[PDB]
């Protein structure tokens, strides 16, 4: 749950010379003292209880353990990590609204992928993932990286479709009846059709990327 995490650090105190038959360890109080404490500024103290432990099977084991329940103050990492991560993530959908003729789709999607990868590595340096628990922020960054890779592949396909002409390709009738007629209706587009084959391919590419723009907005919104 970083940076909204709560840690439970312990401090075990024993005598590494004498066992329970020689010295018995007793607690003077049930909690650690905070009478001369200097606040942290990064960590909040929640509870510092102490307990005296024995072993029913050993009979030579005695220890006193203090549980340090501490709570991170999340403003710093919030501002410095979560906000930049959200800003980068919000750009992962724009490639599907960028027109093909602009000739800049690859730049945008590749740059987003680079930024997400860098942030994933930085997060791993700060809070290392482990089999027990992977930080949720890292999980989200990885999921967004997968989506952006899929978007790069889709953008390459859309660009290939966009630059098609009758001199090099022939449009199958099913491509017509689907992409120029049916799918636009579902997406609320209504091809103007005021009046050529090259423009038909340009519209098919624009229909494909609109379909994915919906999904990425849906999935990214669902990413909330």
């Amino acid at each position: 749950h970083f940076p909204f995490d709560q840690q439970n650090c312990t401090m075990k105190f024993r005598s590494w010379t004498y066992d329970r038959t020689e010295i018995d360890l007793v607690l003077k109080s049930e909690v650690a003292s905070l009478d001369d404490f200097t606040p942290s500024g990064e960590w909040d103290i929640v509870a510092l209880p102490g307990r005296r432990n024995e072993n029913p099977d050993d009979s030579t084991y005695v220890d006193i353990t203090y549980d340090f329940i501490i709570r991170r103050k999340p403003l710093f990492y919030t501002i410095n990590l979560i906000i930049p991560c959200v800003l980068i993530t919000s750009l992962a959908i724009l490639v599907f609204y960028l027109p093909s003729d602009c000739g800049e789709k690859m730049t945008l999607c590749i740059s987003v992928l680079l930024a997400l990868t860098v942030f994933l590595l930085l997060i791993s340096k700060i809070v290392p993932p482990t089999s027990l628990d992977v930080p949720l922020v890292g999980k989200y960054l990885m999921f967004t990286m997968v989506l952006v890779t899929f978007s790069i592949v889709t953008s390459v396909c859309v660009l290939n479709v966009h630059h098609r002409s009758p001199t090099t390709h022939t449009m199958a009738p099913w491509v017509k009846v689907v992409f120029l007629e049916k799918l636009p209706a579902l997406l609320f587009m209504q091809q103007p059709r005021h009046h050529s084959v090259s423009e038909d391919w340009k519209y098919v590419a624009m229909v494909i990327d609109r379909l994915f723009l919906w999904i990425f907005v849906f999935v990214c919104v669902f990413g909330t």
Partner: antibody
Framework: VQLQQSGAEVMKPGASVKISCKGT????????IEWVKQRPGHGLERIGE????????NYNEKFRGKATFTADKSSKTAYMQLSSLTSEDSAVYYC????????????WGQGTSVTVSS | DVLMTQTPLSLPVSLGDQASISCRSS???????????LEWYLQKPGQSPKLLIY???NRFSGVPDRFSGSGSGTDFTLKISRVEAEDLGVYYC?????????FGGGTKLEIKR
């Protein structure tokens, strides 16, 4: 262990009152102090908490800005200051000792009654 | 702030009858240590509350065995085997899982006759 609260108060509307909870017989700085409001009508409403050892404080949304907690470590006393007393603020206020996740509110103050009237 | 709701608002039950008070949370209030922190308090008229149960089931020291607790992620209930004169009061459920920690609405207990 014992939490001794201050005496009853009567205040005019718009004024501010400061009630105190004094804890003895335990490590005062290592236990959170919970402040609870009980309107004469009905209900227990937690106002917030303060850990005297540090300055940490929490407030419930209904009281953010209305109440402010301060603690004195030298004298084992915790204070709650209520500002802009209306007629709703008239109630009995309790202080309780609490350690999250380990010990519940097993010791309470006797209760301090505050009356806002002209 | 997690919202905690108690039912019934009033629970009339004559002496010796089983009593059942239910508390529900607006969210799951489980914790990682294997425990979820729910406590039951009892206040008599003109008195400060008193602890009865903590950590859902664990019973405080010095309280009659008749009291018992049970529940899960978002549903908890209190049980009194037999009711007595001292048992009269208001019962509150307290969640100690998510900051800020909130009280229940209160479930007044009465004896029907």
């Amino acid at each position: 262990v014992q939490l001794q609260q201050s005496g009853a108060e009567v205040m005019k509307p718009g004024a501010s009152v400061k009630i105190s909870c004094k804890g003895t017989g335990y490590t005062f700085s290592s236990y959170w102090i919970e402040w609870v409001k009980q309107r004469p009508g009905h209900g227990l409403e937690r106002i917030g908490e303060i850990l005297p050892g540090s300055g940490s404080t929490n407030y419930n949304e209904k009281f953010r800005g209305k109440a402010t907690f301060t603690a004195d470590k030298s004298s084992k006393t915790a204070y709650m200051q209520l500002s802009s007393l209306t007629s709703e603020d008239s109630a009995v206020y309790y202080c309780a000792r609490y350690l999250p996740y380990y010990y519940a509110m097993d010791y309470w103050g006797q209760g301090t009654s505050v009356t806002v009237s002209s | 702030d997690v919202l905690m709701t108690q039912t019934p608002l009033s629970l009339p039950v004559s002496l010796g009858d089983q009593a059942s008070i239910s508390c529900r949370s607006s969210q799951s209030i489980v914790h990682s240590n294997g425990n979820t922190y729910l406590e039951w308090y009892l206040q008599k008229p003109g008195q400060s509350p008193k602890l009865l149960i903590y950590k859902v089931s664990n019973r405080f020291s010095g309280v009659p065995d008749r009291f018992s607790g049970s529940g899960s992620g978002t549903d908890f209930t209190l049980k009194i085997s037999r009711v007595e004169a001292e048992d009269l009061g208001v019962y509150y459920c307290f969640q100690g899982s998510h900051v800020p920690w909130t009280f229940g609405g209160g479930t007044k207990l009465e004896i029907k006759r």
